[model samples]
Target chain A: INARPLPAGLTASQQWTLLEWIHMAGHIETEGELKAFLDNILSQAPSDRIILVLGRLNNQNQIQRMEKVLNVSYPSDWLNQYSQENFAQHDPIMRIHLGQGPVIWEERFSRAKGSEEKRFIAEASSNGMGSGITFSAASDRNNVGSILSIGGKEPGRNAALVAMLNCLTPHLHQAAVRIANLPPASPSNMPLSQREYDIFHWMSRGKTNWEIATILNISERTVKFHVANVIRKLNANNRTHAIVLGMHLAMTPRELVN
Target chain B: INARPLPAGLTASQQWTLLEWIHMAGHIETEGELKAFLDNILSQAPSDRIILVLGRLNNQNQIQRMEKVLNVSYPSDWLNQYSQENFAQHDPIMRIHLGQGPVIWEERFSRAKGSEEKRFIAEASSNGMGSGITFSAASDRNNVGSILSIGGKEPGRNAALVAMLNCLTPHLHQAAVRIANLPPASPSNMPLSQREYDIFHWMSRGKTNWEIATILNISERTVKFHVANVIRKLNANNRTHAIVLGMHLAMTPRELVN
Candidate 1:
């Protein structure tokens, strides 16, 4: 059962490790398991603490709440103090919707220019928060987002950790949301397939059918078919109006669906 | 960013390859891309044919449709003949809901008892179809399932391929559904978290809270909490009826949520 030429660059042992990791991560059936799994993965990195915050984020990338925190390894007193001090309101990392990649906490820490921000950093440093990295992912479809912060991991020296976490974090975020068992968001007025979304996104950027075809590595015929579907779904009279309606209607950035 | 003790057994290059494979699989933005991605994954396994069928199955495990087929590598003439012959009506593999592992075709082929079944298998073999495996996944929440069959590869000697494809198939199934742009199934009366589902699942099997706690490596208090939620969600008068209601109401095997 082990003989096969693996994906280019992957040795047999690596395939086994990856297969094991993904299986555990994908099939987690309990919060305790989830916590243990997060702890195990973080142990592979230079992490002193790992906090996963599960909550909702609005379209403007604003947090609706930091609803449930789990797998937290930070000190309880520091957590309480941070809460009492309202550090979330002042923490630079919490101010913006994190981008798709890991954001180094030190970078945000260095930019703490305001008094509250500086004091927040000072308190966290004094509490031994140390260097850290934050990974965030959201799904507008579910009206949910998760922020995972790993402390004591210096960036630039942990590519494997970053790569592993980058892939695993989204799945972890999803597992946490499933554990929360939130209701589904109300259906949108119209929905587009990933292909149609891409087509219209490029259309909003002024790409022609052939250009979209080339950009998507599809035949122009396929591009035209999806374009027609976009037009019909948006109830637009033409491609231009379809673009306009799409921008105003269904332009939420595609979230990680899995 | 390249230095870290990798996951217990993986090397740096293996990590890079896994990262790339997962990113492409997870972030495919178009049907064209999905097609090319499946083809690429299949190329790693010994296979002369790949067929993916996306559709729904009723509670009785009956197929509702073979709605969408993609990444097809079989001969078109055989495909046409198979359809004209209504092979699906007699194909033993299609007669059952596939389990959670790769199903070997030859085993079913040997078990074919009916004359029509033997004839269908004979025709498929004549079309240069060799030993093959089928990977299936379904989401009852979405009312969708996908069956992926890769022909021309024997079993037993392709463990890595099976491991790789097993992880990738579910994600590929989901991407195909999104590309098809189907409407969501109406919401169930109540939802359960992974932990709650696991808790109730064990409860249905007659396990006690402490037993559940030990089995899941969680505190007994946590198990009790989820049990209460399950009772409340099911609106049962007590634990026994909660199990009954749960069996009558939510007994759909937990489909792959991600």
Candidate 2:
């Protein structure tokens, strides 16, 4: 280690665990390998269970998509109850994080302002997902980050613990991305030309080919040609699906915005 | 420290830095704070810069999409070149990662298999991107993960360093995701009750309400009510459309199994 920093808060065991995770980050090449790592992490975890979700948030528009990373340990069945009910769409935790930026779950729930969010809190309470820190780690350019709800039941959550979980989440999120080994959707893969990619970005944003042509100051026919290429390159059947893929592949701010 | 582990690899200062990062993980609640932390992590990194991308592989349809996650530590110009040329798709490194699972870039490039991947290697070399290990992590389900090339120019890459770099990436990736905070695509505002969501997930999975009720041991009538509620919540025109909406709503990495 060359330029590491030392902090004083964690117990020695906790420090050991964090170091181990940092060391283990690369060796994990498969789900099982990663699973062992996650289990190891949870073994000494302060919470009964933790839920990690890596998400993509459209920077300007705030459109978000989240996937629960790895095998969920957050009482999946009941949370399944939450997902099925669509409560997570307006999940108070998510709202608080979005509406007001990353939030403390307990505090947000205690004084949730909206009915939809409150309903989620009430059901979460019923299911005993009553405590945790709702953490979100987002970036400036890509704005792709994660929201994590860690801690639960037993002793419950607070800011000090939230801080650790906050730090733990990015590692967890990064680990999940690697462990899962998911694919990339981008103009590069489909071999879309830079022009086609530009076209696809606008088309996916709900601009019709003609409007895209107008915006780019190109002929509608040329726009159509680029768009068709994008559709083919995206290998998508329609615009929305192409949009989804472009999004998943990580578009630039300029492309995503105007 | 109560039970911390001692390491063989780092200087006292480096060790302290890692401890600090571990400590910092818990307290970050803003983008600015997280950036400083990632920058600090990268400050001592082996590579002058790193490029890490996570992509989603569409197992069933062969329609995979990739997006760059984490911050772009790689020089922006090179990334723009790789991206504009859509080089990542044919990235010899990405190819090796997918074809053979985890691979070492230096070894893979010696007898690089595909022309496109080989081209990627050549260009990367020309860009002074030489000397780095390419590490890819994918999953059995969505098959999404990453390919990271670490160390270059001044120092170049090696196995021993790659080992440490490997351990370091997740922290970097995690930090990036949090910093962006881009939103998802679903209509998260529409709320569904627990029963309705459960019914929606299964229904979208193609289970009949009758089958769903039986699976959950609930009444068919109750299932019907929940289904109707889900449809209403999604504002879908029909059961089939509702199923699509539900599927989109519930889509996450873990749920990609089906």
Identify the leading candidate in terms of TM-score: 1
CAPRI grade, predicted model 2: incorrect
Error of 1 at B177 (Å): 6.4
- Which candidate has the top score in DockQ? 2
Q: Compared with the true structure, what per-residue lDDT tens digits does model 2 show for residues B1-258?
A: 011233456654555555555435433434356545545555665455655555544443121555534444667566556545666566555544332223555766787677877788888888877666554444343344455555455343343344444444444433333333322212222567776767776886569978998999999988888877787776677788675444435754232210
Chain A TM-score values for every predicted structure, listed in order: 0.63, 0.57
Give a tens-digit lDDT track for model 1, residues B179-239: 5545534322266688787888778667899999999999998888888888887656788
Going through the candidates in order, what is chain B's TM-score? 0.63, 0.53
DockQ of predicted candidate 1: 0.06
DockQ of each candidate, alpha-carbon based: 0.06, 0.13
Residue A256 miss distance in model 1 (angstroms): 32
**How far is A19's C-alpha from truth in model 2 (Å)?**
3.3
- What are the RMSD figures for all models against the true structure? 15.0, 11.9
**Per-residue lDDT of A8-65 in model 2, one digit per residue for the tens?**
5776556565566554542344445655655565565544565556555554413266
Error of 2 at B56 (Å): 16
